[PDB]
PDB file of C-alpha atoms in Angstrom:
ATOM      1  CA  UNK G   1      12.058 -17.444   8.487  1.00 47.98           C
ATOM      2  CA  UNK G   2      13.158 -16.956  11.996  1.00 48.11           C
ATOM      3  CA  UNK G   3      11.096 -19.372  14.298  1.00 47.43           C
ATOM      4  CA  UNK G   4      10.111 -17.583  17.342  1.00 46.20           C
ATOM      5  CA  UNK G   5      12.193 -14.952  17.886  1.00 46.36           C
ATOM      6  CA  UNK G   6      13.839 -16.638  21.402  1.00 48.94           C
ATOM      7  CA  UNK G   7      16.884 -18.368  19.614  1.00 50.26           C
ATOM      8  CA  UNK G   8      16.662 -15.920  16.423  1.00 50.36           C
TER       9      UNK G   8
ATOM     10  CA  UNK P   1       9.839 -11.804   9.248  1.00 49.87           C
ATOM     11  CA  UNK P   2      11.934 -11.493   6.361  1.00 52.76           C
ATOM     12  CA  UNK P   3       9.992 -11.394   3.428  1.00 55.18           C
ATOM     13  CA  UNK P   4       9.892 -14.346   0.548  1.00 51.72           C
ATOM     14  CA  UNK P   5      13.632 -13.652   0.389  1.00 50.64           C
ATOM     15  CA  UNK P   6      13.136 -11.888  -2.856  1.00 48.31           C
ATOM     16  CA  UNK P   7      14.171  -8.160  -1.222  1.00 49.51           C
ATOM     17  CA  UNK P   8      15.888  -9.582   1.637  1.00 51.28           C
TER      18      UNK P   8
ATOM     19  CA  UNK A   1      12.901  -7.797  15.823  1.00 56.98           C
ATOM     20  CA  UNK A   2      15.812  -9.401  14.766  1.00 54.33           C
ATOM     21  CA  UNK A   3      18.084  -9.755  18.044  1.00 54.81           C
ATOM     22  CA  UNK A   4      20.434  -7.047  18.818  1.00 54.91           C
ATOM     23  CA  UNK A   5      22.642  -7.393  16.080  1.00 53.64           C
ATOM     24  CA  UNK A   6      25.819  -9.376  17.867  1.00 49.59           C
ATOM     25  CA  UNK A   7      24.483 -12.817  15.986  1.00 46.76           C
ATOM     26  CA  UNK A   8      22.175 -11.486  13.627  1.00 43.10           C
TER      27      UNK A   8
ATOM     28  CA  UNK E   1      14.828  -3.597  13.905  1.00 40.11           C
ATOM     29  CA  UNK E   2      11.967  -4.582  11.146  1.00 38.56           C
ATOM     30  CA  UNK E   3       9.514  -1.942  11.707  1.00 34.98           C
ATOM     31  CA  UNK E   4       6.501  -2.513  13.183  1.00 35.20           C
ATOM     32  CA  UNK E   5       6.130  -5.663  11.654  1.00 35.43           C
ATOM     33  CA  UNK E   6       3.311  -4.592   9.292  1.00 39.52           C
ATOM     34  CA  UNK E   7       6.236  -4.119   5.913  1.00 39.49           C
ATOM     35  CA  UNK E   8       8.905  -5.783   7.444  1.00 36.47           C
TER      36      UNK E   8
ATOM     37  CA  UNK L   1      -3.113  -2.096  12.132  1.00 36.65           C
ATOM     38  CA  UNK L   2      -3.159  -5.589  10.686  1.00 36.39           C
ATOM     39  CA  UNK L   3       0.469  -6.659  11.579  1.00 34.68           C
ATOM     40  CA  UNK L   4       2.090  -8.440   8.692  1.00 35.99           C
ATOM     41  CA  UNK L   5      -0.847  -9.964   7.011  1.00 34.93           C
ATOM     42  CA  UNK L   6       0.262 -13.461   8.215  1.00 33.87           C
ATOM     43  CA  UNK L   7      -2.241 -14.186  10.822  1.00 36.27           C
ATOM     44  CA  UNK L   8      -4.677 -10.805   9.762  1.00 32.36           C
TER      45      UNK L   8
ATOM     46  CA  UNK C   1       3.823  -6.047 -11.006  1.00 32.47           C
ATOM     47  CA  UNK C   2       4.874  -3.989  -7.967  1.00 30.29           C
ATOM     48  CA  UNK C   3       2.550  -5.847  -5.235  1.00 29.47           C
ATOM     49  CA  UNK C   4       1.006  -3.670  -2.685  1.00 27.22           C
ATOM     50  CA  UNK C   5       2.748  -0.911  -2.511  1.00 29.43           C
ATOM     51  CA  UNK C   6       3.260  -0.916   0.825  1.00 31.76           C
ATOM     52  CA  UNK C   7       6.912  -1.564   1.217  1.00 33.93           C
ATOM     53  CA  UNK C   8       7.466  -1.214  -2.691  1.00 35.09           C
TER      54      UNK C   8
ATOM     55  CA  UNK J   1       6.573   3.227  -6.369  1.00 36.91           C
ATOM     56  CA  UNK J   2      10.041   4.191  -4.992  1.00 36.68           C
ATOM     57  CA  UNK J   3      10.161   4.254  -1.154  1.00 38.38           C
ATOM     58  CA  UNK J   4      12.683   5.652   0.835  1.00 37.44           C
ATOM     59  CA  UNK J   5      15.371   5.303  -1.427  1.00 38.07           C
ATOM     60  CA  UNK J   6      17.713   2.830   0.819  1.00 36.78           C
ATOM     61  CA  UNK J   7      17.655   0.162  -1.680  1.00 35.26           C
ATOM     62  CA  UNK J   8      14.929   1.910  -4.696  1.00 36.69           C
TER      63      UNK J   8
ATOM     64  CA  UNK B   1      -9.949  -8.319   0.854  1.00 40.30           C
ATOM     65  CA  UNK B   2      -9.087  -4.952   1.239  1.00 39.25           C
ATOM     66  CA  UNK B   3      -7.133  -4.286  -1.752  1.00 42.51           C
ATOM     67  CA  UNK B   4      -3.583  -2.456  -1.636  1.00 42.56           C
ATOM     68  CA  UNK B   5      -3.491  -1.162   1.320  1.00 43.13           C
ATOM     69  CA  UNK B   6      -2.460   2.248  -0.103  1.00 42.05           C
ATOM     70  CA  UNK B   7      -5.689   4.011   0.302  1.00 40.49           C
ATOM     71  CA  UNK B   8      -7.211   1.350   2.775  1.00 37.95           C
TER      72      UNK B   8
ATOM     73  CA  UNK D   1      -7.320  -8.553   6.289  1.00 35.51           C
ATOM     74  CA  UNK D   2     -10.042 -11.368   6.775  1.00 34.75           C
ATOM     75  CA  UNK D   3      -8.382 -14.459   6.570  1.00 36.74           C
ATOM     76  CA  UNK D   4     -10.056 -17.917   6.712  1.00 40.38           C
ATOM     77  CA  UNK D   5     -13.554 -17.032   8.499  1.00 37.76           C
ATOM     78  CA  UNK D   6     -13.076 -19.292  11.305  1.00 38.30           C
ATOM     79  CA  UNK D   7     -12.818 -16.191  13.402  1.00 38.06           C
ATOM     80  CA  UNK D   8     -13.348 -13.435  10.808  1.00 38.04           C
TER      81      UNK D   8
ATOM     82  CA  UNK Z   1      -5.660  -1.200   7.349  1.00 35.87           C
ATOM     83  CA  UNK Z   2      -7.682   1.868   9.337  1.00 38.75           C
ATOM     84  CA  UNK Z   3      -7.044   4.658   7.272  1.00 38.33           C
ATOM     85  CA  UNK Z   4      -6.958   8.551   8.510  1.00 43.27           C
ATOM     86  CA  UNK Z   5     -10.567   7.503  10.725  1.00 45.86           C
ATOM     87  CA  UNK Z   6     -11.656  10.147   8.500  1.00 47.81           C
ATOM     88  CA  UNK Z   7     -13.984   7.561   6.894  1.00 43.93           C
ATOM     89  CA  UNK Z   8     -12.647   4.403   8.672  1.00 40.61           C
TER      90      UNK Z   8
ATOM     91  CA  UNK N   1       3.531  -0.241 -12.465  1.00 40.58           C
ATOM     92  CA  UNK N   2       4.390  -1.735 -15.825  1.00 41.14           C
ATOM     93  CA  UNK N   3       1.210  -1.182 -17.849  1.00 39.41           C
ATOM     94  CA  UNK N   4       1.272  -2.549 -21.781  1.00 40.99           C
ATOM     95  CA  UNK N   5       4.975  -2.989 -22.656  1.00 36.48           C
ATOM     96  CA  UNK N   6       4.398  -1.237 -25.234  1.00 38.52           C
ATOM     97  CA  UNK N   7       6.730   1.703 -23.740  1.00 38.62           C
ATOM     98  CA  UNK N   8       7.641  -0.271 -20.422  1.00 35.33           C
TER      99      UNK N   8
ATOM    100  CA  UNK V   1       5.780   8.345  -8.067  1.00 34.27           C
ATOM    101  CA  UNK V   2       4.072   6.096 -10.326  1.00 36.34           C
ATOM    102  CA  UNK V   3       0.405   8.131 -10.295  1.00 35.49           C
ATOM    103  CA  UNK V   4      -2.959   6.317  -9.486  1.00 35.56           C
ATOM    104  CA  UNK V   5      -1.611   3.409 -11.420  1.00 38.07           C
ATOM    105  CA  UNK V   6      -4.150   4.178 -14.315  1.00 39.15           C
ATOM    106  CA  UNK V   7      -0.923   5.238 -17.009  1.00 36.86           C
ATOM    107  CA  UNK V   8       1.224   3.542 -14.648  1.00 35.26           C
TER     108      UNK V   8
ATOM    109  CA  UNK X   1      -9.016  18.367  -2.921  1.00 34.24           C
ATOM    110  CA  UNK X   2      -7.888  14.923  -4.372  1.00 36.99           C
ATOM    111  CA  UNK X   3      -4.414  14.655  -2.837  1.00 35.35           C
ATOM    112  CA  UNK X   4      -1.455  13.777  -5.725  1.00 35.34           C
ATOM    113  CA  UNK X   5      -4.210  11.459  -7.414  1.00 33.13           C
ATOM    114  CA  UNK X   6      -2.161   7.722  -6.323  1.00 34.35           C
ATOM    115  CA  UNK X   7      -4.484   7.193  -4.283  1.00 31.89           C
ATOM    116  CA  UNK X   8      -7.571   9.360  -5.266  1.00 34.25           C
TER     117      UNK X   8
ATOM    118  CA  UNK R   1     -10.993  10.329 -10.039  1.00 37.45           C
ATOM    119  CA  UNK R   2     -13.524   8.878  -7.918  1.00 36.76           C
ATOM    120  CA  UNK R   3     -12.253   5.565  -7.756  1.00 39.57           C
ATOM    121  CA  UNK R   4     -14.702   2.962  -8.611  1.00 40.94           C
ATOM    122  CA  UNK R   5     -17.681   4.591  -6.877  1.00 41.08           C
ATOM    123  CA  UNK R   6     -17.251   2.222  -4.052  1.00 43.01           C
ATOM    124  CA  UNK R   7     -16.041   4.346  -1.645  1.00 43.93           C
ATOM    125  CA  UNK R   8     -16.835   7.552  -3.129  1.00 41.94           C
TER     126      UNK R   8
ATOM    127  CA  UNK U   1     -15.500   9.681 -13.637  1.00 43.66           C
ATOM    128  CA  UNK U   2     -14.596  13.183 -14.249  1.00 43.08           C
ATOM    129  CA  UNK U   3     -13.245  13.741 -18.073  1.00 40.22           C
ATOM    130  CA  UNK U   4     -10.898  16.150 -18.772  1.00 36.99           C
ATOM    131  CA  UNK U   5     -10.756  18.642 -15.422  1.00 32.99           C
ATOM    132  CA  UNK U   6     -11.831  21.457 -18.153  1.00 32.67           C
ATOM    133  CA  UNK U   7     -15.499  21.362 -16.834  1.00 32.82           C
ATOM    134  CA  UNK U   8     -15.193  18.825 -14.022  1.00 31.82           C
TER     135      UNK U   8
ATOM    136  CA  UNK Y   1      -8.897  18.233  -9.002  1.00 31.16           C
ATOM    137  CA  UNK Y   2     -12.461  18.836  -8.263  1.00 32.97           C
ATOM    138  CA  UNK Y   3     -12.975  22.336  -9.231  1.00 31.87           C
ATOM    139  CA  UNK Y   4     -13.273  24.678  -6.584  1.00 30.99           C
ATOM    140  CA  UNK Y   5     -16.263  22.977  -4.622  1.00 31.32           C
ATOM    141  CA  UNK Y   6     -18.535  25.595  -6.009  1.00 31.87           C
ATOM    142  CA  UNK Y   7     -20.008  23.418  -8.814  1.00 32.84           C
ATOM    143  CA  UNK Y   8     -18.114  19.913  -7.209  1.00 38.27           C
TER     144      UNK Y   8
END
């Protein structure tokens, strides 16, 4: 959960 | 991030 | 971790 | 937010 | 140390 | 039952 | 067993 | 490897 | 702590 | 993982 | 945490 | 809380 | 010596 | 006490 | 390891 | 736990 941390 | 969704 | 907050 | 990372 | 355990 | 202990 | 007490 | 984590 | 052996 | 560095 | 069932 | 796990 | 005895 | 004799 | 704590 | 060191 969260993908890269850029959009999320 | 996030755990297994279990706690959060 | 996480953003600020304001979206998440 | 999360901790270090390491629990959260 | 460690991080997460994900990648260690 | 429990896990590591480590955040529970 | 039993954390900080913020959600155990 | 490395068991709980509690004592290592 | 390990992981696959590739690199540890 | 790492400990006190009392042993590790 | 648990143990038998017995009493838990 | 819990002990070394041995009871509980 | 020991500490509580959860861990030794 | 002792654990399993593998560290101590 | 250790029986009671009465001699060890 | 341990005794005093003088035997352990």
């Amino acid at each position: 959960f969260x993908x890269s941390x850029a959009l999320l």
